[PDB]
Amino acid sequence: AKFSAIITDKVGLHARPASVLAKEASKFSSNITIIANEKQGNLKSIMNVMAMAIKTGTEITIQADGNDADQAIQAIKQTMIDTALIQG
């Protein structure tokens, strides 16, 4: 399962949103990867996500693989919207 979106947050994918996303992703059995530029990371890891240093305008792709992938993708998309990282 997957979705792509453009990061519209003016600070990028920074601590607050990364922390919230890592928490949310960690609930899922699925493997949840975040892809940006040439980098791929585990969305469940705040360090991994911060290390990606995703900045505004970057188009990211979230890929969920696993038994709860469909829920996971929606949960993650909503989370991004809720944290204002992306536009709903």
Report the catalytic residues: 14
Contact 31, 72 (CB under 8 A): no
Coil, helix or strand at residue 32: strand
Give the E-state strand segments of 1-88 in sequence order.
2-6, 31-36, 39-42, 59-65
